[PDB]
Amino acid sequence: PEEVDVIVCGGGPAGCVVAGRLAYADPTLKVMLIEGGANNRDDPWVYRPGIYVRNMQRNGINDKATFYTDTMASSYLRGRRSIVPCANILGGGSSINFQMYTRASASDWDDFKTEGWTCKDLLPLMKRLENYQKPCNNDTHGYDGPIAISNGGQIMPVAQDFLRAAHAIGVPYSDDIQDLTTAHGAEIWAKYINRHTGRRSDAATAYVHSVMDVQDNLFLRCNARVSRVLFDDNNKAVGVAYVPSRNRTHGGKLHETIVKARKMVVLSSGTLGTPQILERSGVGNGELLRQLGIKIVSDLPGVGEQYQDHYTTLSIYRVSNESITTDDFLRGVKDVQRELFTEWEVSPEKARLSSNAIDAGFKIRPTEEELKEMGPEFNELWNRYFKDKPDKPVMFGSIVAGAYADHTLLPPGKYITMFQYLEYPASRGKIHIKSQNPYVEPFFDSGFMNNKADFAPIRWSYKKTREVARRMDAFRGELTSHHPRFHPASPAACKDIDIETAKQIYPDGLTVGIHMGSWHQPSEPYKHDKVIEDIPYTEEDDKAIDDWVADHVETTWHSLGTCAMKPREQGGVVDKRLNVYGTQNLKCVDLSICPDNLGTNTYSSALLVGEKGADLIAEELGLKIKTPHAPVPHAP
Amino acid sequence: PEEVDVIVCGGGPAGCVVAGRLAYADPTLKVMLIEGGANNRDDPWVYRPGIYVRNMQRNGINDKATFYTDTMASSYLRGRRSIVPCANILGGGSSINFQMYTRASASDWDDFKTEGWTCKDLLPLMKRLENYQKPCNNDTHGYDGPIAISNGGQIMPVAQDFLRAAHAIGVPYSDDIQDLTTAHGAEIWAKYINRHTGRRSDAATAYVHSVMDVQDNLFLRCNARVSRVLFDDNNKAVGVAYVPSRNRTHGGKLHETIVKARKMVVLSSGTLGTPQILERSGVGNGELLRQLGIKIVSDLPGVGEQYQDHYTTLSIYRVSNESITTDDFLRGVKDVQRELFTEWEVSPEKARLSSNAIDAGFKIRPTEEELKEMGPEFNELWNRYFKDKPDKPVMFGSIVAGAYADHTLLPPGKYITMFQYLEYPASRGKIHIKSQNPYVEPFFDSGFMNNKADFAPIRWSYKKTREVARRMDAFRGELTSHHPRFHPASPAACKDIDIETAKQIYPDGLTVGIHMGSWHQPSEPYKHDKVIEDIPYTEEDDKAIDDWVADHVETTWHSLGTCAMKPREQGGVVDKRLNVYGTQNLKCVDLSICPDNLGTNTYSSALLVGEKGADLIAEELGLKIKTPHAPVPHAP
Amino acid sequence: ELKEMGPEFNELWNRYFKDKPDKPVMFGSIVAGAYADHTLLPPGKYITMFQYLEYPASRGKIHIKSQNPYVEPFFDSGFMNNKADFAPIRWSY
């Protein structure tokens, strides 16, 4: 219809929870979800975990992502314009992400320094979302929420190889590193996949499609880019306008359709999508809205400021050819793909495709001794942020059974990638609209690495994860092309594939073992009995790793902080109930509200923010949340 | 975690019973299971029965096994060094074995000469562990235990061929040779495979993973080598020290983590693993420890003595090309392997891969007539040991529908092997550590055949099993190459493949039937009418079999007796409750404790010992065991 | 182009190539493929500009180490032990 009670704008995790919970809470309450991206209901290119890699392809076909490029070349990235993609589909990140189950640490929530957002406070909500389907030796998880969490159809043999190697450098094993209390140790790494169906646990099918199947009070509009929030004379949100996804209107004319909201408007268009809708509605930096010809509804300079992410490095390593990897699946080899697709359809609960192949990893924290070697500028932060926060980790590290890279730019053979990310970076970016027009790309700045304290931890990670690589059974060398530019004579120089392994790739090849060019220093053949010693590094080596970082550091899609929940004189954007200052009947519930980072893959978090905002809206509307939620399609 | 109540060392079946039963009797009881090898949970190379054969490959890739090699060469095996492998995975033998369901005879347990270990005393515990999923005409088997037993998905046509042949040489058919009573009979042979799911009945999934799914008191540390047991001032067991599987630390330098036990320390690291743990803890031969510089805790010289095993011989026969066998699958013929893997995924309840293809066999016992033909030294052992013990078989004999043998040394075509073993050897061995280091190999000595009584029965078997093969429909010849070196004109000399079978193998080959070299004596082509009479043997022939026994006899992986349960003054190591003499809170519960051999494939034996040890620790801690156990994953 | 190439290659030019007009400095040829270990190359198709220095200044040596005709001798390519050789190859690239 034209009018409804609640409007959710952006169908990410947070938005899907809000829209679903409230609708199920009261069959009368007419509520509508509006999403720029397409509907994801029963799309095999969503519900199948194994194909997740393809969503980040800039190949002119894929449209499940929008790609936001740095407006200016960053000095700090030795000249590059950082790319930060985000989701453009119902379910948002939930429908396209890597599907790693990680939780933030207890202190991360405490450090929101807001009433109702303690660890204490959110633990029941954390439980309310989870359907934990794997063993653990603690009580910290939920067992009847709508979001399935499991170890997937099949862990890869490299997982336990990685663990054996982690142990050999003294990162301890743990049954569950997602227990809110841990910041140093290594686990078998769970996924958002239903143990029994092998399907991706996406927020849309869990919270929204569940309800639409059983009630008539939840309205879904997809392929609907939300332009702006229509305001009152009093700055009460009265409604919203939306346009077609594509700009394929005759003339390229703007075709707005207005939808009205009796009670509440909710913005859930994500860290990058929310502060644009606010801005072109009139809720932003005054000087900016003025320059674009936008009547100010509320002067909030913090709208689209303090853009926070996790900073990813990907260290790639060649592995033996009898190793199990995703490389040939990712390459598009037609009987490798025909096989896994078939396996999934016949036996999902055992299928390789019922996984992300990211089956092991650690949270890590530096020793006293190691801290000396890291920067003054990092040592400052240590004392400030980490020193007496023993439950906060500095780095992440996982092992992907396969290269997460353009295979069009990788030699033949098998690989593993050490997927790394900085947990609480000091650097900060921002995002601002360039026009009222909802189709024009905004201004954007990653801000990756513009604080010098963010280098030394990542550098420490490269070295650390490499010592794990070198001690794995499967290891057969570093991929020299994608590693730091070490001096060739340095004891820290890379060693690429060994001759035995190369010949197996191309056993009729005319070219294997031709030294002519000296493009790679070969590894010696693998010995089981080898006695291994740490790589020594110099200041020159460190300068190389530092440079490599600048050149190859990336987003982790764990974007937050662009509509911060802090006091307004500190530049914040929302209340402890997430209302937008200077307005009535408008909230932001998504990861934009975070005032500080969380040491975790942020799907868990976006869901928990969604759960908290569903409580805040429920008690404001005089409603109560039903447990359990409506049955989730295809679940046993 | 740093401290627990019970610590079980080694995740063999016995260990898995102990760790699982106790954690499930009392959810307060914090129990940790420590396992040298990797976790077997949902490994398709563990749970699919038909790939079991790969686990004994010495190919520098497979690591689900450790290989012990005799320190010295044995005169008795004509100068070779015996190789005894054992399991190196969670579940131990249960994850990698032949999955043959066999039980010992009643007298075997009675002959332990220990109260609480009578057949009578253990029969209820025998039934507790079994889930019997096949028909039989007795009341000897359990029906609600964790470990599922069946005839698998599909019996092979050679099974009833073998029985028809056994019948024709006077071994009678029986519904059940595993009734504790039968010593001379032939059955269809059952497997540790679930009838409904087609999955392997491994101890870990049944006892441990079942529990860990539903409680938080059972802790699992895999890839962790138990070095030594930590002792109190009064020889009480206070904890355990473990190191990583791989010795891949910086500078190969030792790294022990410690874990303390409040109540009990159980050892289940196997016949070969257990004694080693005792000896480097300071429990063993007083002199050996003195020289290795280990402080004595308890002088028990018989730690690592009385190594008993079952002695395997493998008689290979050629069969018709229309026979159905595992040979092409074992060779790696991709579309044979693809047809069988796929069949298992779609319908495990009837798949060829839901089997071990050891689908029939017999326990056998010699006549008065036959005894005379055996030695003086075996007739002596016959009177002393078998004469008034009629429920003990002398030899086990079964048919593998395929060649259990390196196919790299086999001609093309189809095979069946007669898998034979000696049920009670007189011959004896020993194992002792060489260092305080846990990474070093121990001094080892199989002891195979060092007792001359052990030849005659094996020679007797070769003759007997040959007469069966020759009377089969599938039989097309003896594989001369892998048979005893008979004189070529001896009426007992081998006849190999006939010409019609050979032409079938290579119908466009230029070489089939070239006599040049006279490398084989061809069989005459198959006649369904052929009258058959026993091969006669001379003394020279018998010598050729004796030598063939010395050359080709192996372990059956049924290793026992290295921490024996008898009075300490008879060189015993444990109480009638399995307490280590001269210590407090320390028990061996695995097959090490057995004072004598068992006429059985020893997975059943190890489980029972486990069930018994669980009873003994349950009454000592005033716990009560729950029946049924925790529901086993994927079971109906 | 001679100005780009530095003082130690100009001293060679005057000494060796100046009034010797039939002497080339660098050779260059297209190979229709990679001449390199394909084990170290991404997928796709390639060509290589195969380049070599016609008259290097750098010198090497080879002497035996034993009377035995099977032991490896001492060897020294001597490549680039004369800075004059860098500049023309750079110009080739």
Ligand SMILES: Cc1cc2nc3c(=O)[nH]c(=O)nc-3n(C[C@H](O)[C@H](O)[C@H](O)COP(=O)(O)OP(=O)(O)OC[C@H]3O[C@@H](n4cnc5c(N)ncnc54)[C@H](O)[C@@H]3O)c2cc1C
């Ligand atoms: C490729 C990838 C990998 C990731 N890796 C992991 C991982 O390993 N583990 C993990 O747990 N999480 C991972 N995530 C992170 C996680 O998915 C995000 O933190 C989470 O999805 C963000 O939730 P959100 O509600 O704040 O916004 P989003 O999920 O981004 O959803 C915002 C939605 O709003 C819609 N929208 C935007 N603008 C408009 C508009 N104007 N009108 C209408 N609709 C609009 C978008 O189409 C989108 O669907 C990753 C994310 C991505 C993209």
Ligand SMILES: Cc1cc2nc3c(=O)[nH]c(=O)nc-3n(C[C@H](O)[C@H](O)[C@H](O)COP(=O)(O)OP(=O)(O)OC[C@H]3O[C@@H](n4cnc5c(N)ncnc54)[C@H](O)[C@@H]3O)c2cc1C
């Ligand atoms: C290839 C094979 C074929 C067999 N065939 C059959 C058959 O056909 N039928 C049948 O019924 N049975 C069979 N068995 C025999 C049966 O499996 C064994 O007798 C039985 O498993 C022994 O049980 P256990 O508890 O005594 O020790 P094990 O099964 O040997 O298990 C010992 C465990 O302890 C671990 N370990 C060793 N040392 C240490 C240490 N220092 N620290 C920590 N952990 C350690 C090992 O990794 C292993 O997992 C076979 C076994 C194998 C391996």
